[PDB]
Each structure stands twice: as C-alpha cells, then as structure tokens.
C-alpha cells in the first residue's frame, strides 16, 4: 500500500495569484519501461464528483485549463495553478495507480481571498403558518461577507438567548468568493408570545459596531 | 457523450443491506474496468476496488473486503454495488468511475448517498419568510423559505422554477434530534417585489412532498 502525503492541507490565495501544492508517495510511481509516473490529480468542487486534471504525473487532461500544471517524477510531485480563479475553489487530490490498491492523498483545499465585505443582514419573524402549528422560528440571514470569521448573537427584549439556535454556513461562493450564513431561533408559540423585541447581532471585522436587525412582535 | 447514471439516495437502518447501480452509456461497457470510490461526510476519497467488466471478477481493497460486493449485468451495461449488514459507519456517497489504461478515471457517476440510521422518514414543513411589516425599503430585498422537520436528507429548493438562480443561497441542512431543517434566501430588487411574484419550490421525495410557497408581504 503506497501512502500519498499531500501538503498543505489548505491554501488561501487571491484571484490572479499562482499557487502550488505538493504530494509525495511512500515509493516510486515510475515504470522504467514506459518511463511514466502513474500519479493523477483530481478536482472536486462542493456537491460534485471529482474530475481529472492531470495524469501520467504531468500530462494535462483534454479540455483542462492550461493554468493547471503537474510536475515531478519518482516520489515527489506537485500541482500548480498559475492564475487562480474564483471557480477553482475546491479540494484537490492526487492519486497513484502504479501498484494497487490505488491510493488517494488527503487533499488540499483551495480557498480564495478577496476584499473585505460586510454582510447584508435580514431578519424575519415567524410565519403565520408556523404559528398555527404552535411553533415559532425567527430567521436571520447574513449574506455575502468576507472573511468567514463571524459571530451572531440573538437577543430577546435585550437579553441574549443561546438556547434553541441553529446556524448554517455556505461554502465560499463560486463567482463572488464570499460566504453566507443562516441563523434560526425557534421557540414555542407561547414563549414567543411573551416577548416583544427580537434581534440578531452580527460582529464581523468590517465594523467595530455590530450590525443589528430587530423587529417588534407588536407591529408584527 | 459518455455517461454513468447512479441510483438515488438510500436510507437503510443498521443491519439491513442495500444495492445500488451505475449505468454506462456512450461506450462499449465490456472494454473498460469499472471502479468504486467512497467518501464519508467531510472526508477524503477511498478506493474500494474494481470489477473486470470483460470477466466479471471483482478485486476489493482490504478495507472493503467482507460485506461489499461488485456485481455485473453486461446486457444492461450496468454495474452494481451491494453492502450487506449495514453499519452506522458506511454512511457515505459511493461513486462509480470508468478507468482508462493511462491509469486514471475520466468519467464518474454523481455518487449515491446512503444513510444508515434508525430515524423515521418524516415530511417537512415549508414556511415563507417575508420581511416585517415595519421593515425599511432598500434597493434590494431578501426573501426566504424555511424547510423544517424532515428526515432523509435529499431535499431540493428552487425559486420561480429556476428563473431566479442568481442571488440565491441555500444553506446546508442541519441535523437536530433526527430532524433536519434548512433555509434558503433569494435577493431581488425591491422595485420588482411584490410587483412580480416570488415562490420557492421545495420537494422532499423521501416523503412524496412537493410544494410551492408564494411569498406575500406583511
């Protein structure tokens, strides 16, 4: 079993820059008679299946961008992206097929870097439909921001509520290169009927002051 | 040109067994080895083994040696993968891929997710997310759809049947005590809403759920 070691586990570059990632095998993947190294490179984007970029260690696959280049022979190999685009965000894996079992590396995640951007925040009261069911979810969207570091805090009538909160984050955008978040607070229709103010606070980097969005159960 | 279609998401309980397919199209099935690669949630790819299509003989990797079986139906140009005695660890995607002599995969299936759990399939509740009555009007308005309380994960969401695909954000579903909840937002110019309608289309096949929720103000 040949072991494939990839490094670094993650790389962050800004559009246009050049990036290079390595992959090393526990032994030579070179066949001295055909004189080729059977190491291949695959690209896997979120929600997709992997797609080859290079084979024979340094032969670009038909139809693959010329900014993708594989190098190396023996046990040390590298994959180079000359000018990184937004749509290159993904995890790259190398694979040896010199001797079975075919083995994959752990992969290297390519994350983009862009200008900081504040998230546009939107808050939504429970729907009359949900309220009928005796439930009550308050939703807060924090979309298109950067960097990813961000913390949301809910407050009911001025007090923080940590209980019953559910968050979710999207993967870095394909063309925007930004991140989006979703925070949902659910309560019973009853506990929700006892309070007036509901607000979610987002603390980013783009401002010393938290972006706030509230709505009162009164007018609603 | 060449294609590999894979069976849909599977939901089995521990102990039961499952079998999935992978149909090849556009090439002579019998001329290329067919391989299986799996991937657990938030993990890397693992080579499972391969099936000699001209011979039917399967080769398994030490890790997938035991309760896994590669099958074949040459006439139907299809390959099958069966996993017996399912354990709460086989929860993965499972891709099928065509292998070339240059030793690399050039065609893959989309992958067939299989969930091993004892949780019960349950229909979702779809709620429209319209801003508050006292919400301030900006150049753009964000609307939302909340899908809560469903189980088998496979759930899809669209807006205006795809017409609105730019300005959308669908968040990965979060699991909470056997029940997932998901949300999706769409942002369009205020000048077009509520002038032009906006509806979210969600479908949870596992429960025969299909609904369209129009987003009405207030």
């Amino acid at each position: 079993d040949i072991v494939m070691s990839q490094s670094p586990s993650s790389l962050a570059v800004s559009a246009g820059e050049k990036v290079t990632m390595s992959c090393k095998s526990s032994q030579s993947l070179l066949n001295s008679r055909t004189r080729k190294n059977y190491l291949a490179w695959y690209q896997q984007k979120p929600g997709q299946s992997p797609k080859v970029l290079i084979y024979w260690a340094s032969t670009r696959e038909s139809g693959v961008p010329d900014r993708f280049t594989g190098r190396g022979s023996g046990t040390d190999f590298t994959l180079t992206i000359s000018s990184v685009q937004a749509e290159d965000q993904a995890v790259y894996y190398c694979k040896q097929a010199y001797i079975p079992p075919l083995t994959f590396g752990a992969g290297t995640k390519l994350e983009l870097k862009r200008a900081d951007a504040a998230p546009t925040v939107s808050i939504f009261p429970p729907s009359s439909e949900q309220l009928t069911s005796g439930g009550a979810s308050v939703v807060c969207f924090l979309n298109n921001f950067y960097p990813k570091d961000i913390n949301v805090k809910w407050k009911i009538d001025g007090s923080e509520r940590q209980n019953g909160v559910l968050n979710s984050w999207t993967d870095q955008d394909s063309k925007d290169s930004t991140y989006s978040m979703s925070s949902t607070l659910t309560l019973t229709k009853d506990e929700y009927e006892r309070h007036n103010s509901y607000t979610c606070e987002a603390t980013h980097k783009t401002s010393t002051s938290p972006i706030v969005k509230s709505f009162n159960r009164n007018e609603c | 040109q060449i294609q590999l279609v894979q069976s849909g998401p599977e939901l089995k309980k521990p102990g039961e067994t499952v079998k999935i397919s992978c149909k090849a199209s556009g090439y002579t099935f019998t001329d290329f080895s067919m391989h299986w690669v799996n991937q657990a949630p938030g993990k890397g790819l693992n080579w499972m083994g391969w099936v000699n299509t001209e011979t039917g003989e399967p080769t398994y990797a030490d890790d997938f040696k035991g309760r896994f079986a590669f099958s074949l139906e040459t006439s139907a140009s299809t390959a099958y993968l069966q996993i017996n005695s399912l354990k709460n660890e086989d929860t993965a995607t499972y891709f099928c891929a065509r292998f070339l002599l240059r030793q690399y995969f050039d065609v893959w299936g989309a992958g067939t997710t299989v969930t091993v759990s004892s949780a019960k399939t349950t229909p979702p509740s779809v709620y429209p997310l319209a801003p508050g009555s006292a919400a301030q009007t900006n150049s753009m308005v964000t609307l939302g759809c909340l899908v809560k309380g469903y189980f088998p994960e496979p759930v899809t969401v669209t807006w205006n049947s795809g017409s609105l695909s730019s300005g959308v954000h669908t968040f990965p579903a979060v699991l909470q005590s056997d029940l997932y909840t998901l949300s999706s937002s769409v942002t369009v110019p205020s000048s077009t809403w509520p002038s032009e309608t906006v509806t979210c289309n969600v479908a949870h096949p596992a429960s025969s759920t299909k609904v369209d929720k129009k987003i009405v103000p207030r």
Binding site: L29, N31, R33, T34, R35, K36, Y38, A97, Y98, I99, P100, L102 | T28, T30, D31, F32, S33, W50, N52, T53, E54, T55, T59, F99, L101, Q103
Partner: peptide, 16 residues
C-alpha cells in the same frame, strides 16, 4: 479494448 483489463501501471509495457 477487450484483451485484458489492467489495473496498475507497473504491469504496463511500451507499445508493441
């Protein structure tokens, strides 16, 4: 083609 499906570049020889 169908003559012997080979998995492992180590088993390969140059054309001819």
């Amino acid at each position: 083609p169908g003559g012997g499906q080979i998995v492992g570049g180590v088993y390969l020889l140059p054309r001819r």
